[PDB]
Amino acid sequence: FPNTISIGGLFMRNTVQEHSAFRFAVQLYNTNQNTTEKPFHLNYHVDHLDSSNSFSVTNAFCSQFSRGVYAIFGFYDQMSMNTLTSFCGALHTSFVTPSFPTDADVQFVIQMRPALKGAILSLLSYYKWEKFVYLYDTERGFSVLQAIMEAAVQNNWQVTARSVGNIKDVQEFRRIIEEMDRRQEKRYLIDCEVERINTILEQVVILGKHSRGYHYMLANLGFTDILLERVMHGGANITGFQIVNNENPMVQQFIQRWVRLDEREFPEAKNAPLKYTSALTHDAILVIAEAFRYLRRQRVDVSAGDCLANPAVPWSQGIDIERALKMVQVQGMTGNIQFDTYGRRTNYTIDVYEMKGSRKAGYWNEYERFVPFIVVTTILESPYVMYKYCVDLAYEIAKHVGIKYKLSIVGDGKYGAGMVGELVYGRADIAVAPLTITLVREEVIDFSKPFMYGVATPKGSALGTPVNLAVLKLSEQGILDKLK
Amino acid sequence: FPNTISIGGLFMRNTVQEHSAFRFAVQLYNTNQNTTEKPFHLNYHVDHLDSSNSFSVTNAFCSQFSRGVYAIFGFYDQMSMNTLTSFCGALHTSFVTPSFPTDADVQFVIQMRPALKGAILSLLSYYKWEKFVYLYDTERGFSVLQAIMEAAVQNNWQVTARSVGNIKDVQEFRRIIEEMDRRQEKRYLIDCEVERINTILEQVVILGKHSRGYHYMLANLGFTDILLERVMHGGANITGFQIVNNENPMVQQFIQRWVRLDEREFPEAKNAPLKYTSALTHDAILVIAEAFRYLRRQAGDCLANPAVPWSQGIDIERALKMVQVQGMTGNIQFDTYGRRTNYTIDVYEMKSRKAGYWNEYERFVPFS
């Protein structure tokens, strides 16, 4: 058993943050003082890939294999998954990847990104969803799509599935959402790359469908990276997913060190959010270290030939070393880590963050399935308000937003100068009434879209966006026109 | 220069007839004793391969390169195109592929299956289509989809573009067809593999929608393989695209010579239709022979650390990319980038009949 272990690193484009994380994690392992914790020195041979020129990928992997490595940690996408995975399988070299898990079953490759199939199916069943839309792409394998279609067949769901991977025009998304609108479909299940998720959310916000009664389910790890700033204020149910839990000791212990790292040495270290891929990279370092520590615990021999063998001369000990990376049980940043005989992660935990501010909504496990945890002002001005239109509009807005409203006549009995004064000074919350729009009033309070005028809300009030969306919906439904 | 030239073969899994046609064309090229049409003997170190295992593809290509080959002929599917095309571009080894045009500009390759997007656009313009549904597949390249999207945007058409191709159960096809029916769509543009085309046609005929007043555009070079029968019933208009003419004496001679071939020695010969891929392969042999003859008249490790290329590969590519030979598919003239330049696609309707010519410089010209 050698006293120094060298492993290779393959990083595709736009992987700077996890490159820094990989370097930081290997440094953390190396700087350990305990002999048992650091039984040997660890070296990392980093490289880069293009994922488009297969010759470049083959040359990089060939250099890594020839120069001599014991394990290869790296990423891959749909373009270069087959090449690297097949070479690793043929060469009997363990390949640790935090990339998307391979839909097909391939040996000698370990993939640490937990599958969303179980959690997504359990949550979908838990919400009593029966008819919905399924927007997807195909850059993370076909596991999710196949599972969703099979579940729909078994449970007689009404799943309208659309692929948006090939879409390059936003107007395509706009037409798709308008079509699902005319079909009245309200529940969406989006599982795409963060970029396409952001584009779809931007398009739907522009069209104005982020209101109560519309659900969303971003079935994609990396809830933080999603630009959901606008949609939150729309008051539309959103269900996300995340693996790392902040409050556990491990994440805090890591991040405390991480925030203080050099910016030049570690790009996107201090000033970037910790993407879950970085967490999985840290877990990769932990699992490799534990596996090799276990190897040295026993007397297993570990010890590189031509790049392309005729027909094949895989060094035997590889089958042993791969087996070592299958029974590992170290509790890393993401939580429990355990690998099935094939390589896919098992016994994992998923945290289902639900929006409404972000708040946890239980958790999902392979064994336990899913376990969860106003004043209105009006002026007594006929015919808008008469002692027994504006009352009907207020009731319609409350219904469309679901808020409990209590009507009242402004004490001053006069317009702003006052009702607007009542809003500004902090009382009466919302206010719906005939208010002539003047540039001065925008300084103090925020209006809604004109409906003949506009509903009034205090500046910065959380109800401004919901009331604006409700007014827009009423205007486009023709009810506002019908009332007059 | 040398009396013998050895080419390499990289036939796919389901290409038995193409293999037989390749061997037959090799025999034709090596049998003429003219001393001018055949100044260099030809040999083929054909090697089979399978997709889904890039290791096998790379190892086979490396072995072929090591054996020493002036030019390589072979097919590639969407899931192995990158490896072969990129190796050939990097190693300066000309690749002749009668499979499908590449979706992007790549040097050091010769795609012959002519791009049919232009003919599709021209014929759609001629027919005055503005409300046609689109059912595309991703197993043949993204060029057609992008071209049709651009045309729809520019020409202000509206097209419903479903994403068939990931569908493994016919119930989804039934749902798609009935949903388009609810939209009263009456014109279809289907771009998928032959098996998917057959499945869609079977589903639509099962739904009894093949009646008159509907037009299916079968945008696939393979027309004979498609089961048009049972769809001509009901008077449903259908249009195809076939490049192999069956009138000129060249194809008649090639057919009459083809049937006599032994079934055992040459499987799928004299007992099956002439897949256009086989004709393209014969044209491949013709063009390779012509380029090598013109060049005459006028080795190492694949994964080399510095990736040093050939000293004469560029000459071979230049010789290949310029040719004006005549084969079954028509006149074979390649553009700078490896695609053909005079498609002469023949448009067939359903009644059957030849309808179109579509020389790229010209436009669609119906026969009166």
PDB file of N, CA, C and O in Angstrom, chain B residues 108-133:
ATOM      1  N   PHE B 108     -13.309  18.075 -42.786  1.00  0.00           N
ATOM      2  CA  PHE B 108     -12.810  16.705 -42.889  1.00  0.00           C
ATOM      3  C   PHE B 108     -13.939  15.689 -42.724  1.00  0.00           C
ATOM      4  O   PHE B 108     -13.882  14.787 -41.887  1.00  0.00           O
ATOM      5  N   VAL B 109     -14.985  15.845 -43.534  1.00  0.00           N
ATOM      6  CA  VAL B 109     -16.080  14.886 -43.596  1.00  0.00           C
ATOM      7  C   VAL B 109     -16.882  15.184 -44.853  1.00  0.00           C
ATOM      8  O   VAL B 109     -16.908  16.313 -45.344  1.00  0.00           O
ATOM      9  N   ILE B 110     -17.538  14.155 -45.382  1.00  0.00           N
ATOM     10  CA  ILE B 110     -18.294  14.255 -46.625  1.00  0.00           C
ATOM     11  C   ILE B 110     -19.664  13.640 -46.373  1.00  0.00           C
ATOM     12  O   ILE B 110     -19.837  12.422 -46.491  1.00  0.00           O
ATOM     13  N   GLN B 111     -20.641  14.474 -46.035  1.00  0.00           N
ATOM     14  CA  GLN B 111     -22.014  14.026 -45.852  1.00  0.00           C
ATOM     15  C   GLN B 111     -22.716  14.061 -47.201  1.00  0.00           C
ATOM     16  O   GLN B 111     -22.719  15.098 -47.872  1.00  0.00           O
ATOM     17  N   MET B 112     -23.306  12.936 -47.602  1.00  0.00           N
ATOM     18  CA  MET B 112     -23.965  12.863 -48.899  1.00  0.00           C
ATOM     19  C   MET B 112     -25.480  12.927 -48.826  1.00  0.00           C
ATOM     20  O   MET B 112     -26.100  13.508 -49.722  1.00  0.00           O
ATOM     21  N   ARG B 113     -26.096  12.342 -47.806  1.00  0.00           N
ATOM     22  CA  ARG B 113     -27.548  12.387 -47.725  1.00  0.00           C
ATOM     23  C   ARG B 113     -27.968  13.850 -47.775  1.00  0.00           C
ATOM     24  O   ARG B 113     -27.811  14.572 -46.782  1.00  0.00           O
ATOM     25  N   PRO B 114     -28.497  14.329 -48.898  1.00  0.00           N
ATOM     26  CA  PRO B 114     -28.706  15.771 -49.041  1.00  0.00           C
ATOM     27  C   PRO B 114     -29.708  16.293 -48.029  1.00  0.00           C
ATOM     28  O   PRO B 114     -30.702  15.640 -47.708  1.00  0.00           O
ATOM     29  N   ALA B 115     -29.436  17.493 -47.528  1.00  0.00           N
ATOM     30  CA  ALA B 115     -30.365  18.141 -46.616  1.00  0.00           C
ATOM     31  C   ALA B 115     -31.653  18.451 -47.363  1.00  0.00           C
ATOM     32  O   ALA B 115     -31.623  19.072 -48.430  1.00  0.00           O
ATOM     33  N   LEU B 116     -32.783  18.016 -46.812  1.00  0.00           N
ATOM     34  CA  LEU B 116     -34.073  18.190 -47.462  1.00  0.00           C
ATOM     35  C   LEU B 116     -34.873  19.343 -46.874  1.00  0.00           C
ATOM     36  O   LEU B 116     -36.050  19.499 -47.210  1.00  0.00           O
ATOM     37  N   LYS B 117     -34.268  20.151 -46.001  1.00  0.00           N
ATOM     38  CA  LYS B 117     -34.995  21.280 -45.434  1.00  0.00           C
ATOM     39  C   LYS B 117     -35.377  22.284 -46.514  1.00  0.00           C
ATOM     40  O   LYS B 117     -36.484  22.837 -46.496  1.00  0.00           O
ATOM     41  N   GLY B 118     -34.478  22.528 -47.467  1.00  0.00           N
ATOM     42  CA  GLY B 118     -34.783  23.475 -48.526  1.00  0.00           C
ATOM     43  C   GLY B 118     -35.977  23.050 -49.357  1.00  0.00           C
ATOM     44  O   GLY B 118     -36.857  23.862 -49.660  1.00  0.00           O
ATOM     45  N   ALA B 119     -36.018  21.776 -49.750  1.00  0.00           N
ATOM     46  CA  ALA B 119     -37.158  21.281 -50.511  1.00  0.00           C
ATOM     47  C   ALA B 119     -38.440  21.397 -49.701  1.00  0.00           C
ATOM     48  O   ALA B 119     -39.496  21.743 -50.241  1.00  0.00           O
ATOM     49  N   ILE B 120     -38.366  21.115 -48.400  1.00  0.00           N
ATOM     50  CA  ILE B 120     -39.545  21.239 -47.549  1.00  0.00           C
ATOM     51  C   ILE B 120     -40.054  22.674 -47.565  1.00  0.00           C
ATOM     52  O   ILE B 120     -41.250  22.926 -47.756  1.00  0.00           O
ATOM     53  N   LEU B 121     -39.152  23.637 -47.368  1.00  0.00           N
ATOM     54  CA  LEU B 121     -39.564  25.037 -47.354  1.00  0.00           C
ATOM     55  C   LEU B 121     -40.181  25.436 -48.687  1.00  0.00           C
ATOM     56  O   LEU B 121     -41.243  26.069 -48.732  1.00  0.00           O
ATOM     57  N   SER B 122     -39.525  25.070 -49.789  1.00  0.00           N
ATOM     58  CA  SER B 122     -40.025  25.465 -51.100  1.00  0.00           C
ATOM     59  C   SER B 122     -41.397  24.867 -51.368  1.00  0.00           C
ATOM     60  O   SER B 122     -42.299  25.558 -51.857  1.00  0.00           O
ATOM     61  N   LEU B 123     -41.581  23.586 -51.050  1.00  0.00           N
ATOM     62  CA  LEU B 123     -42.856  22.949 -51.347  1.00  0.00           C
ATOM     63  C   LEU B 123     -43.957  23.496 -50.448  1.00  0.00           C
ATOM     64  O   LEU B 123     -45.101  23.659 -50.887  1.00  0.00           O
ATOM     65  N   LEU B 124     -43.636  23.781 -49.183  1.00  0.00           N
ATOM     66  CA  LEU B 124     -44.622  24.399 -48.304  1.00  0.00           C
ATOM     67  C   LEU B 124     -45.043  25.758 -48.840  1.00  0.00           C
ATOM     68  O   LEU B 124     -46.233  26.094 -48.837  1.00  0.00           O
ATOM     69  N   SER B 125     -44.081  26.554 -49.309  1.00  0.00           N
ATOM     70  CA  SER B 125     -44.427  27.839 -49.905  1.00  0.00           C
ATOM     71  C   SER B 125     -45.317  27.648 -51.126  1.00  0.00           C
ATOM     72  O   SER B 125     -46.293  28.383 -51.314  1.00  0.00           O
ATOM     73  N   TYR B 126     -44.997  26.662 -51.966  1.00  0.00           N
ATOM     74  CA  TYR B 126     -45.800  26.426 -53.162  1.00  0.00           C
ATOM     75  C   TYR B 126     -47.230  26.032 -52.807  1.00  0.00           C
ATOM     76  O   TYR B 126     -48.183  26.520 -53.424  1.00  0.00           O
ATOM     77  N   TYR B 127     -47.402  25.153 -51.821  1.00  0.00           N
ATOM     78  CA  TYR B 127     -48.731  24.693 -51.437  1.00  0.00           C
ATOM     79  C   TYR B 127     -49.513  25.724 -50.636  1.00  0.00           C
ATOM     80  O   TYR B 127     -50.711  25.526 -50.412  1.00  0.00           O
ATOM     81  N   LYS B 128     -48.878  26.811 -50.201  1.00  0.00           N
ATOM     82  CA  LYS B 128     -49.556  27.849 -49.427  1.00  0.00           C
ATOM     83  C   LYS B 128     -50.063  27.288 -48.098  1.00  0.00           C
ATOM     84  O   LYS B 128     -51.237  27.423 -47.746  1.00  0.00           O
ATOM     85  N   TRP B 129     -49.163  26.647 -47.358  1.00  0.00           N
ATOM     86  CA  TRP B 129     -49.503  26.096 -46.054  1.00  0.00           C
ATOM     87  C   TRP B 129     -49.220  27.121 -44.966  1.00  0.00           C
ATOM     88  O   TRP B 129     -48.146  27.729 -44.937  1.00  0.00           O
ATOM     89  N   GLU B 130     -50.189  27.315 -44.072  1.00  0.00           N
ATOM     90  CA  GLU B 130     -50.029  28.254 -42.973  1.00  0.00           C
ATOM     91  C   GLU B 130     -50.561  27.735 -41.645  1.00  0.00           C
ATOM     92  O   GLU B 130     -50.429  28.436 -40.637  1.00  0.00           O
ATOM     93  N   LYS B 131     -51.154  26.544 -41.606  1.00  0.00           N
ATOM     94  CA  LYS B 131     -51.755  26.005 -40.390  1.00  0.00           C
ATOM     95  C   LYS B 131     -51.433  24.520 -40.259  1.00  0.00           C
ATOM     96  O   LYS B 131     -52.297  23.698 -39.953  1.00  0.00           O
ATOM     97  N   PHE B 132     -50.176  24.158 -40.493  1.00  0.00           N
ATOM     98  CA  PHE B 132     -49.760  22.762 -40.495  1.00  0.00           C
ATOM     99  C   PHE B 132     -49.064  22.410 -39.188  1.00  0.00           C
ATOM    100  O   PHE B 132     -48.206  23.154 -38.706  1.00  0.00           O
ATOM    101  N   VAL B 133     -49.447  21.271 -38.617  1.00  0.00           N
ATOM    102  CA  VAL B 133     -48.821  20.762 -37.403  1.00  0.00           C
ATOM    103  C   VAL B 133     -47.488  20.121 -37.760  1.00  0.00           C
ATOM    104  O   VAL B 133     -47.284  19.644 -38.881  1.00  0.00           O
TER     105      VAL B 133
END
